[PDB]
Write an enzyme that holds these catalytic residues in place. Structure first.
Site, PDB file in Angstrom:
ATOM      1  CB  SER A   1      -6.836  -8.535  17.772  1.00  0.00           C
ATOM      2  OG  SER A   1      -6.858  -8.919  16.411  1.00  0.00           O
ATOM      3  CB  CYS A   2     -10.567 -12.837  18.086  1.00  0.00           C
ATOM      4  SG  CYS A   2     -11.184 -14.549  17.909  1.00  0.00           S
ATOM      5  CB  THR A   3      -8.940 -13.798  12.580  1.00  0.00           C
ATOM      6  OG1 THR A   3      -8.603 -12.425  12.384  1.00  0.00           O
ATOM      7  CG2 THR A   3      -9.423 -14.332  11.238  1.00  0.00           C
TER       8      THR A   3
END
Ligand SMILES: [Co+2]
Ligand SMILES: [Co+2]
Ligand SMILES: [Co+2]
Lengths: 467, 467
Positions: free
Chosen positions: A6-8
């Protein structure tokens, strides 16, 4: 099924920032779990001309004139520590760590290609051969067309003028958007591009994308083209895992344009903040797990509002990475790698100059067995000691980060301010990067000492008595 | 009183869908519990000319020119395995598994006929003798007048042009509405037809329906005719068992035309979505538990605004069946049976071509004792393995469904794109159906391996930890 987390990503155009720079950023989860943060220079030397993809082993022919680039490596992998992001010697920034989404209607037309490129390949095969963000877009698009890909990915590009967001679409297609100068984007692991004008200078895509849509009944809308409606997802998983992250960032930057539903599937892609955006802002959003009374992670009430939304950029691995291309400075000192350090809840970003041929000694040594003279073990010590009584250390954590950023910025400012008569700019910048590494270490050392000093003085009368 | 289950039907007109098709659908009542579900072809020979009703044993004489049709069966009965739904060789679709409601004022005039037809007879006695959705309506109406019925039923018909919904009324009466081209309907186990124009080309009913109402004080309203007001129910049970299902679908497709009261007794029958509807949308709604923030099945805290409002399709008995008549392709490949497979939370729908004389070898064998080469037993295994740690497997489950659907659509698209030069279309489609059954199997097999592999490495460091 396979790999990845998970990456933003946060993108900022040159008029949207406080200092006129472009910003592209990401936070990173590790797959196995040790996170020594390193940054590496890849000289034209070390660049293959006959490249072999990491997972698929396909052979890719690369041009013979690769640019030097600085790289930020990653997790455990299946073939070498591939670059996740970087800045080349032309001050072009690229980041390829944002898995996005798809849907079965387009996949039924242009399926993932199992022998295609993956995100592990993208920086290596794109960044060294382009001199602008927009060239980064065209080269990547052309390579997806040729070798295909087995993944859904989002890729950011920036130079001192422009920021682009590219999204891969099925096995061979793609679309990309120039972020307006005064705009910003918060993008989670979900296809992001919404309203799309094929005509625009601000857009690029597969030459057949519009026909692909029109001729195959892909468009769910009565009017116009919304690419994530067409090619992306609006799933149950999105409402809790992706959208609240978008919402949270947009609430912070644009409180008066953002309603109160973190589950909203149609939050805009392009946004306008009510103020100019700093590096500290981006760092905070990429670090912060929804904290005002709403959605801690977590503490005092509720937990009917909780356990079921997705924290950013905490779950954890917690590496914030910010690529900044500055303006109104000589081009040779414009490229900055804000690199994470790290770790636990005591992470900071250190602004290394990207324009160098070698790295501070710390980032090629070991990092063998425990040694407090080593930045990694010192960080681990601070990390572990942190969860002792962690809201006894919450206010000295904020002072630590403030004090460390302050010290980093002093070095950046002094270095910038004295550039004009320098005969060896590259060595000049190597020395600055070494001052930065040193003070990053000294600061965490001051931190260890302050924690132990006040901790020993509190544990002393958490044992209760005397005047 | 006696047998039967819970069903939700969704109808989509040809201008309302994303691909220009008509859609009729249903999710499937569990009878007892045998849920390996068949796909069956009924050739004109196997059609009785002297039919014997299932329960009442009344004898019905049928025409001697029955069309071939594909049938979708059930489990437990007092006689056999009646067809619940099907597509005939003229590309007329029919589905008859939607029990509705009535009231004592109409029943006091036209009681249920104890020896009449029931839903178990309807497909058999209607579908093979009609060449349009509308002919199906007129024939069913005539057969109710003649043999009566002991039940309240809702029946959907579709061809490539029209979608019709018929509701039976008392022992012999009926009414039907053509769903407008750009509209959709969500219809639960409650009489659905509201504002009704007897005059219209878009409606059909008993020739005495208006007189029946006018002459017997059946109409509760000051103006006009609302059939479910007149003939149906607005009961306490409707508010928790029927209306929330309607509300949920209408919230999903028409979010800005639907208020926030799921108990609402007067949700419209005909609706207009804010977008075109896909097969995937229909599948999701007929599968989905009412989620997020408010009411799951079951979840968040604290469970009394979380209720006796009940899940569709969780009771559980999740067999989603979607009958699609396409336009956009030659008529010979237009009829698609999207069939469930299945089961637990591990069901997908497979697009079998209806225009075939035989069924994949899968649906002709045993269905004996445990064997992992058998689709049913493989399914039970993944299903059972699913409730170990049910949201350690939920994210690889959404990807299973996405990835299987894509593979199905790839096959559908490839089969469609090469139809024009085929000399034996029937054998061509049988072969394509066999590719589909195989890949569905292959995809469930890959899931078992991926579930066990990731399961074997996570429960294994229930060690509680360390590298
Ligand atoms: Co124009
Ligand atoms: Co130079
Ligand atoms: Co209309």
């Amino acid at each position: 099924k396979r790999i990845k987390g998970s990456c933003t990503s946060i993108l900022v155009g040159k008029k949207a920032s406080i200092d006129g720079s472009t910003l592209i950023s990401r936070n990173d989860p590790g797959h196995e779990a040790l996170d020594p943060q390193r940054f590496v220079v890849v000289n034209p030397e070390d660049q293959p001309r006959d490249y072999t993809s990491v997972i698929s082993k396909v052979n890719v022919k690369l041009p013979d004139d690769p640019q030097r680039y600085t790289s930020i490596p990653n997790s455990i992998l299946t073939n070498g520590i591939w670059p996740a992001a970087g800045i080349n010697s032309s001050n072009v920034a690229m980041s390829a760590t944002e898995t996005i989404t798809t849907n079965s209607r387009v996949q039924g037309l242009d399926p993932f290609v199992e022998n295609g490129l993956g995100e592990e390949d993208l920086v290596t095969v794109v960044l060294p051969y382009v001199k602008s963000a927009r060239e980064g877009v065209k080269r990547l698009g052309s390579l997806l067309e040729e070798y295909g890909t087995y993944e859904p990915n989002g890729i950011s590009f920036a130079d001192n003028e422009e920021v682009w967001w590219l999204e891969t679409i099925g096995g061979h297609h793609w679309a990309a958007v120039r972020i307006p100068d005064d705009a910003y984007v918060v993008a989670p692991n979900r296809m992001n591009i919404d309203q799309f004008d094929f005509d625009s200078d601000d857009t690029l895509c597969s030459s057949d994308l519009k026909d692909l849509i029109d001729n195959n009944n892909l468009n769910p809308d009565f009017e116009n083209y919304n690419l994530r409606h067409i090619f992306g997802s609006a799933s149950i998983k999105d409402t809790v895992y992706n959208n609240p992250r978008t919402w949270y960032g947009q609430k912070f930057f644009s409180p008066d344009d953002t309603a109160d539903d973190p589950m909203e599937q149609d939050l805009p892609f392009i946004c306008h903040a009510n103020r100019k955006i700093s590096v500290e802002d981006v760092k905070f959003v990429l670090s912060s797990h929804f904290e005002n009374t709403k959605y801690d992670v977590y503490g005092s009430g509720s937990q009917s509002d909780k356990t079921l939304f997705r924290p950013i950029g905490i779950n954890r691995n917690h590496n914030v990475h910010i690529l900044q291309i500055r303006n109104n400075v000589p081009t040779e000192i414009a490229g900055i790698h804000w690199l994470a350090y790290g770790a636990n809840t005591f992470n900071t970003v250190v602004p290394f100059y990207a324009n160098v041929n070698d790295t501070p000694v710390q980032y090629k040594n070991a990092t063998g067995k425990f040694d407090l003279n080593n930045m990694y073990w010192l960080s681990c010590t601070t990390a572990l000691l942190g969860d002792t009584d962690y809201d006894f250390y919450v206010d000295m954590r904020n002072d630590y980060e403030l004090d460390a950023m302050s010290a980093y910025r002093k070095i950046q400012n002094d270095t910038d301010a004295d550039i004009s008569g320098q005969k060896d700019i590259e060595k000049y910048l190597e020395n600055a990067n070494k001052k930065l590494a040193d003070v990053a270490f000294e600061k965490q050392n001051k931190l260890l000492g302050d924690m132990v000093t006040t901790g020993s003085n509190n544990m002393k009368l958490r044992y209760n008595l005397n005047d």
